[PDB]
């Protein structure tokens, strides 16, 4: 149950492991001097769908979330054997539904008592 | 903005001016429009139909969902961005 | 319809009638006169009061079944036995009743319009009511009305949604505009609930400054049943 | 539906228990020292 | 020259793109050549309805429908994580310290991600102090015994349940948890955690943080705040209450008002911020670095806009503290002037 | 039974009502934002509950997820830690003999008191020796009838 | 009065816009010369019939 | 081959248009129906403007005109010719066809129909508030919605933004065509997160009243 | 419910009560719902087996 | 009102007083099981001749 997932796993481009907000500026160590300072993101450039320039996290060197539609993983929850709270518009029909005796004799929200009342 | 689009930061700063003016405008609009839509207590009486021509329903509500201009992704010339939503967001980020 | 073979029935009849005239040696003619002159529309124009009365009665008793003070169906001039079929095409102009009645005449090579005429009446009526999509409209049932919806403030569940309360539900209520302008939009899911939230009124307590505002989630129906609304009002 | 399934690109479908590629094939090839005991 | 602009190069990047171009869409005959939305989206919006729904959609913020004309299967979360581990040579700094023992159970390859079970613990702020983590883990055990008994008698949370049932069920489960033994074999010592005893916990934290049912009773029943019982109140046989029962919610509901605890958990502000408004998050509250640049009158527009926004939410908290409500019996909004007492 | 604290209420015109705390807890606000209980959660997320109670925020997680369908009595398989005392929703074999190999019923809560992971001590199908929630009746029902 | 007059005026305006949105949609060459600004440079404030 | 089919289709449409204009300049109710159905609102409007004068109409006459104004023949014309037989783009490529003026006509007509329907309710001897429960007015709702979906995008999104809202406000208990047009307007708006919600309420309450045109709304909106 | 399904549920000349059975929309309702309960139970058991293998101990 | 009251009391003493203890009912399991036991016992005469 990853915390702040709706900003981290879903909307943080690089899955929260990749750090985008940085420059290509040269540091005198032999590792960080190998990266030349790149002149900034072009002002009026029309960039591609997967590639950004890399100025920010939301505009990273390779956009990560797809343009597909974002739908949850369809839960494994049993919507069939589940004991759910009787709404007024679930009891407005309570005399008509074919249910089992756990449905009628539930401890939590018993429904036969609702029917008999 | 139109005039000074090519200027790397001046365009972005004038686009901030745009986003502030249009925010003021759309707040103005969302209150001075629900005001004109609250002027329907003149017509919520037992002139229950008043058959064809009501001003709010729908001479005024026909015009539909409003588009605020702080959000209307307008391009250089004053027409919506041919560039995509992403490109235009980056282009119009803050001078910060 | 696309091929305009609606009238190939009468045109087969006239082509045969004219294979009679040409075989005798008489020249022939193609016009509305021979159209209305074939036996078909002669016998199908007499059933016009019979079919139309049935259509009207079917749809008025259906509405009485399911509101019933008005019907959608226009005035069929009853005793005016003439304006039945033009009334029919004005009433269900999406299909050619001239062809429906002349199709539903034969019932397994059996001319119903000579023998089982009430059978033809309830047959061509079924056929017009099904082929004409407008018939489906004015034969619709009373469904119920879903109030639009907006998310909760004190979020007990997300599936539990501030319901839209219209003045016809509650007149002793707020001066509300439409649900769009007041923010609600369309949403319901396999578990959705419709709710009004307000919290218990806080007096001068310490919880009333350091805790959360406890809500009593007053849950309202999922449907605005205007039919039961006017029915309650008739029941006073 | 989608010829490339949902569970592979869907971050909503991402495994809370996705234990990665080097992880297990590294923590597996180890052999913890055979001499936990002074004697044995 | 290597990486130096040149006129043949200008002529060449133009002869390469627009070789014999009759118009920008000369090669837009191929489908997976036409639908590409790299250098814009216009060529795929061919009627006014297309661009109409385009702009309405971009106003309402939904992802532009002609944007989705190219299918950009993103980068899989698994690929980004796998690449990260590959660059950083196993994320050795990130695994859970149980990864590094014999046969880490499958739960021990997934990284030290902030899983929500630290959503609620007001005790530990950012670095759990001594025995703070050990008590938080004991209470992880306590809420787990909670879950056991909750599914046990079937007090599970319900997808479509309402508030009255919620708190009825809550006070229902509190009754059995606070009265039912707390299970100790479940007390699993994780990586680098200290395995401690109940008496030591009850000594350092007080038996108010680790209350026995009797002390919890003394907290729920009486009304005083002056009694935070940081030590054992004896048993009904005259002894020390060497026992603990499950952590429910009503007991903390009792504590959270006594300013001894509201500071013990360092959320002390509640006295100083209880009845007042939040700071208005004004859209476009620009920094002085471009308040410098808003011209003589655009600065004025900016300040008028922000002033109207602050006044908006301030009158909004006025209407929040009013708490006027619709008495239908008067068809109006009643604003309470005073309260009573226990009636 | 009722233990009410009355409220002297002011009306829009001027008259004062003697209305109960309960009966105004039901009557509807004028403007109900979501940042109202911020005061307990200042600056940080403004919630619908007390963040002070880890336990109540934990039932926040419980109810929120269980509404979202992240939790639920899904069908079980062998992989889910079927150890002694895991809460489990079983389905009963409703008692008959001359019937063909079993007669099976609705979901009824249970908990496991005896289970073996061994593919030998627990063959196909793996009879889960369970004890239900009604009175603790111990019977062996396979994992096909467990949630 | 002014509301219905503006109604008739916006009728005319949207008709002059529609008589343009049809033309650009059904021009095969202005659509091969793909540009968005086509749908935008002309509008009922500038198409030939004007109110002044 | 496709060109020949488009030419032969525009020929039928244009010949019908010309023969109709000739009838009109040179009976009246079928004339107005055919005019508004091929797309000649601008001439079917003055016909009804004088048909209204003498109370030559009823509840359902303006209703007929409303649905016939949605131009089914012109829809099929545009469909064959410009849409390349595309049922979604036929709405988007009809919406350019004076969809506002056709929409203003459909609107004013519906309001006239409401007038006439309440007039009938109060002249039918039972004087009281009952124009809504008249399934006739509900079908005016369905017909105005069908005549709006054929118009511009503004109105395609107005069907469930102001027509549905006004329906609820006046108390018109919705019919199946209203729910399927809720769905089809949301579907040509792009708001599947609301269309599948409508469908959820239906399947969970009135699946006997779901027909295939609503699943059509879904298969169009997801598209 | 559908007329095809009723005409398939009641296409029988005689049944269990010593008399032909008339199956309505609801006597077939409980039938199709029991069947669909069965199919969902089997389907979700599948998916549960389909998430259980992980790289660690598949 | 007496008619209404003594219908209330009859449905309160013969059905609702029975179903008051869901735990007594075993939540449907016990009720089904006892039916299955009744037919267990009288296998002889229910499906006989």
UniProtKB/TrEMBL annotation, chain B:
Species whose genome carries this gene: Trypanosoma cruzi (strain CL Brener)
- The protein's name is Mitochondrial SSU ribosomal protein
Automatic annotation (TrEMBL), chain E:
This one is known as Uncharacterized protein
The source organism is: Trypanosoma cruzi (strain CL Brener)
From TrEMBL, chain G:
Name assigned to this protein: Uncharacterized protein
What species was this sequence derived from?
Answer: Trypanosoma cruzi (strain CL Brener)
Automatic annotation (TrEMBL), chain H:
Name of the protein = Uncharacterized protein
* Full protein: residues contained: 50 to 291 of 581
